[PDB]
Design a protein around this nucleic acid. Structure first.
Lengths: 98, 95, 79, 103, 94, 79, 98
DNA sequence: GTATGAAAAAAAAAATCGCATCCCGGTGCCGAGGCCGCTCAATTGGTCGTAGACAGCTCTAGCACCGCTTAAACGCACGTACGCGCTGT
């Protein structure tokens, strides 16, 4: 067969997804998740199909936004793989925990 | 001279209600003072928006509450929501 | 248990967009956990806006107002 | 219109109304709404100007969100302004940190 | 009901800057939000500027000072101008 | 050139208080540069408050209002 | 003779300064610096003796605040010495630069 | 532990080969542009009241002087761990 070396793909995958703006999480699973968490605070709740997307948007862009910083952490450690402790470090400095 | 108001006198009464046998420094007092004004302004602000969002011109005890829920962490808000509600109910009945 | 509905590869993507080449198998769970925290914190407020308005339905606006409050403001849903 | 007296597009009127009904102060110095309306117009433009250049560089007539993002983020100044700001279907500026690249 | 916008003003300005370039509903809505924010940011800083100095009247002066603080250097300068220009031109047009 | 007036050891201290154990000789300059940036950004506004008030003296309040604006709020000078 | 081993002091120095609240920069040099920067925006400026301190406070607490994060960066790199690139990384993630 | 050969295997360069992205048509159809009818909000012009302009008096509170002792800064240099680079599951 013919097989590209580990990473080379990812690298392509990045170029692709960087370039596009589409939402990368599957709409329903998310929509459902949103509702599952909704119930915790009040029951018999409805959501504007726009509100759903609205959330999804900020989440992805945030998660992306984190991973950006996350990677910069992993890099600073002479690494290339991101590890929980990278996110943790980022979130700390960000001020999302202590 | 000018007439720069404060909260410094209220702080004292509250201090004595909680730790009668403990004093406080000008510097710490001034701090406490600033602390109040901030939260005041934070709440007032969130409330003013709460009003402006819902096409209202009247900020009521209800608006304050909702603001508090948003601004304060869980346990802190709860204990406050209470000591609020308690202070409202008690005044509307004391005429 | 819809948290898992956030699929390993769906995260892969997000991270790829961040500029990530390689990803510990531990991350995926970590990420989920974070996302939960985020939405929760947000929605809580978002709802709490709704609770004030005397609506049982949550509007986009409620979402925004909350996102703004949480210092992650969003353009493209008005306000 | 007042809008024409300044020579602006933006509705110096609707601003003035928005300000009195806004709970921003008691009284609003008829000058203010002009100054503001302009500022907004300018910012609006400065962006559109840039967005329009990105659109052309994509071979599109119509500005989409992505343009706005790309435009804002590549200008140092606009960026700083919209620091704690998210843009719908904005994507991200193609950047891959060199140590990731191969060989 | 009547959901207001700025969408119409944007268009006029677009054509003044790039006549032969359009825009998307989604981007328009964005631009819309962008305006309201800065508006509110400025108004806000101005309201405080007033309240700090024991005034009840926000003038063209207050707006300016706000802008100086909120906008970065070069952006503020270009704006301070297009402002001042818009004031002067109205006080002379009666 | 008062920037150097911020003495190598005076920084040592600050960093020590942060919980710093060891310090590259490069840091000291780096730190100075940062400090400049900080004060500048702040004072700029702080002054600009003063400039508005028609005062040639800068008040504590002007300082605070600026610090508040710059999202590094300060208690103890009467905000 | 008698010498404490490199670090052991620093460690003490920390305990000490952590515990105390006094200002760690010398008042005048700072006061002077404040004025030197004041001139850049307008000349013949006077400062409330309180305003000066007010600044000094936020600066130190900020610089401390940075160094805290800074160190966490150096640490994440299995190191103990802080290097400019640590601050830089921190400030990036913080959002003080790009 | 130095100059020949030599040599053997990781590192520099081509030719298979293939697989994946861009460009150019070329297919459909939606949601962007401009007409329409309808309300409100923008405009105009009077009425009033009060914020802010102006000039002035009162006294605080920054700038500047001094000359002393003192702890902080400055430096130098001697030696330890601390970081930096290599190597192998």
């Amino acid at each position: 067969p013919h097989r590209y070396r580990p990473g080379t793909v990812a690298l392509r995958e990045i170029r692709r997804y960087q370039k596009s703006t589409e939402l990368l999480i599957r709409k329903l699973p998310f929509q459902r998740l949103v509702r599952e968490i909704a119930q915790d605070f009040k029951t018999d709740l409805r959501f504007q199909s726009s509100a759903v997307m609205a959330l999804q948007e900020a989440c992805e862009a945030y998660l992306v936004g984190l991973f950006e910083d996350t990677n910069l952490c992993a890099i600073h450690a002479k690494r290339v793989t991101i590890m929980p402790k990278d996110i943790q470090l980022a979130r700390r400095i960000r001020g999302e925990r202590a | 001279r000018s007439r720069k108001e404060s909260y410094s006198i209220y702080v004292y009464k509250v201090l004595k209600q909680v730790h009668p046998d403990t004093g406080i420094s000008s510097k710490a007092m001034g701090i406490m003072n600033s602390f109040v004004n901030d939260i005041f302004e934070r709440i007032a602000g969130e409330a003013s928006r709460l009003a402006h969002y819902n096409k209202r011109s009247t900020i009521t005890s209800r608006e304050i509450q909702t603001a508090v829920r948003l601004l304060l962490p869980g346990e802190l808000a709860k204990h406050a929501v209470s000591e609020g509600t308690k202070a409202v109910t008690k005044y509307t009945s004391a005429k | 248990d819809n948290i898992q509905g956030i699929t390993k590869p769906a995260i892969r993507r997000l991270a790829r967009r961040g500029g990530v080449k390689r990803i510990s198998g531990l991350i995926y769970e970590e990420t989920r956990g974070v996302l939960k925290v985020f939405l929760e914190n947000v929605i809580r407020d978002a709802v709490t806006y709704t609770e004030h308005a005397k609506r049982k339905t949550v509007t986009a606006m409620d979402v925004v107002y909350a996102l703004k409050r949480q210092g992650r403001t969003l353009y493209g849903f008005g306000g | 219109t007042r809008s024409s007296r300044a020579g602006l597009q933006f509705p110096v009127g609707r601003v003035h109304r928005l300000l009195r009904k806004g709970n921003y102060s008691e009284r609003v110095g008829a000058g203010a709404p002009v100054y503001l309306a302009a500022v907004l117009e300018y910012l609006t433009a400065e962006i559109l100007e840039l967005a329009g250049n990105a659109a052309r560089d994509n071979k599109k007539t119509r500005i989409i969100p992505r343009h706005l993002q790309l435009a804002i983020r590549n200008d140092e100044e606009l960026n700083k302004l919209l620091g704690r700001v998210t843009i719908a279907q904005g994507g991200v500026l193609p950047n891959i940190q060199a140590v990731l690249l191969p060989k």
